[PDB]
Specification:
part of a larger assembly; 2 chains; alpha+beta; about 15% helix; binds a molecule of 4 linked components (NAG-NAG-BMA-MAN); Hemagglutinin HA1 chain (chain A)
Chain lengths: ~55, ~55
């Protein structure tokens, strides 16, 4: 951020319903997403399961 | 303002229900919390459970 203002970044992380779907899309059995700045840090590990339709 | 509990028939297939530990003894033998259900292995399987209740 070389600008003179705060930048807000919206991002997310996908939670598949089945392992089959997890592998179709991202190969690895279990994913992981880690977004970080010099002073903060944040890490989500997607959970696989059925939610309501 | 109430602990009015209503049981529903969840159907937990492929797992053994009603486990309890000697920490939580009910009467002579051993038991568990009354409104919770300790699901453990059956045979040597724990299926991926997937129930729903509208
Ligand atoms: C974990 O349990 C989940 C919870 O029920 C389960 O998902 C259910 O699966 C059925 C699959 O068809 C879906 O039901 C939908 O219901 C709405 C209500 O009106 C319908 O609009 C729609 O109807 C159709 O589906 C028919 C056949 O499957 C088809 O013939 C019709 O043409 C029409 O397309 C939906 O079916 C939901 O996916 C879902 N219900 C709920 C409440 O979540 C899920 O399978 C299970 N997970 C695993 C891994 O087995």
């Amino acid at each position: 951020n070389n600008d003179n203002f705060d930048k807000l970044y919206i991002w997310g992380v996908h939670h598949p319903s089945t392992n089959q779907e997890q592998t179709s899309l991202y190969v690895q059995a279990s994913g992981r997403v880690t977004v970080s700045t010099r002073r903060s840090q944040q890490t989500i590990i997607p959970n696989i399961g059925s939610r309501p339709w | 303002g109430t602990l009015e509990f209503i049981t529903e028939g969840f159907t937990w297939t492929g797992v053994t229900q009603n486990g309890g530990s000697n920490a939580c003894k009910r009467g002579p033998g051993s038991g568990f919390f009354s409104r919770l259900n300790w699901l453990t292995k059956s045979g040597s399987t724990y299926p991926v459970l997937n129930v729903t209740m509208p």
